[PDB]
Amino acid sequence: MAIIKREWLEAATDAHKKLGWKAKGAVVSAHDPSDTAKGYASRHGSVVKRIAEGLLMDINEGADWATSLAIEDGADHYLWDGDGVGAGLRRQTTEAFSGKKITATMFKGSESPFDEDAPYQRTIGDVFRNKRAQFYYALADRLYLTYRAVVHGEYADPDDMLSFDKEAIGEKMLEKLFAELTQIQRKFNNNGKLELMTAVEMKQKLGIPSPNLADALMMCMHCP
Ligand SMILES: [Mn+2]
Ligand SMILES: [Mn+2]
């Protein structure tokens, strides 16, 4: 039921070095303010460069922490989870980015998918229940393609892959991320759409704590 294989994550570690390409594109950062530990993720194009945990912070301290990291990382775009306790953080977030060319986007995972009437590559809306499922599968698809390139020698466009810059991220935090990603699970859906267990469900059913590093990385798959 899990959507991401550990072997893909191991392959994707330093995949850009293994395959000889460089990060190109926008810098995208995202923040998970927790249900009520926090998460932050940042990538430059297809290369993930920071995974950070935000400990012993209230909601406003967490947002200061995450927005400061976004500034430090040279973000072009910043997203944060607004489905729960984060729903009120827009003012603080825009204040943090005053005078800086950084866009701020509230991510709501429970929304219908982005661009849902577009064809699925029938429509995106037929395939994914919501944005949480859509962007976790964007992540899973990038990782699988990266695995096939790294381990099976199957060409893929770097723009469609994802590499973890291990030296930038740090081994400990990369391991924490990976331990969360392999816990993200599909759940039954009565309309035949892809849908994932929520944190609440993961906690109650399986005793799994909130995967906020994973969620932060998932949100940064959406470049607004
Ligand atoms: Mn969240
Ligand atoms: Mn979360």
How buried is 190 (Cβ within 10 angstroms: 0-12 exposed, 13-18 middle, 19+ buried)?
A: exposed
What is the distance in A from the centroid of ligand 1 to the CA of 155? 34
Which approach determined this entry?
X-ray
Topology of the domain covering 1-224: Nucleotidyltransferase; domain 5 (3.30.420)
Closest-CA residue to 126 (of 47, 34, 118):
118
CA dist 126 and 192 (Å) reads: 8
Residue 129: DSSP 8-state: S
Largest CA distance in the chain: 47
d(CA 48, CA 42): 6
Tell me: is residue 76 an annotated ligand-binding position.
no
- Does 81 count as an annotated binding residue? yes
Query: Is 215 one of the annotated binding-site residues?
Result: yes
The rounded Å distance from CA 128 to ligand 2 centre is 19
CA 214 to chain centre: 6
Distance CA 84, CA 58 (A): 14
Is 117 annotated in some ligand binding site?
Answer: no
List the shell of residues around ion ligand 1, using CB closer than 5 Å: 32, 81
Ligand nearest to C-alpha 208:
2
- Return the C-alpha torsion angle 26, 44, 214, 60, nearest 10: -70
Q: Which ligand is nearest to the CA of 184?
A: 2
Ligand 2 (ion): residues with CB under 5 Å are: 32, 212, 215
Dist. CA 211 → ligand 1 center (Å)? 8
Q: Which residue has the tokens 């969360």?
A: 180
CA–centroid distance, 195 to ligand 1, in Å, is 16
**205-to-3, 32, 213, 222 alpha-carbon distances in Å:** 17, 22, 20, 29
Structure tokens at 32: 């998970």
Contact criterion met (CB below 8 Å) for 168 and 72: no
Any binding-site annotation on 141? no
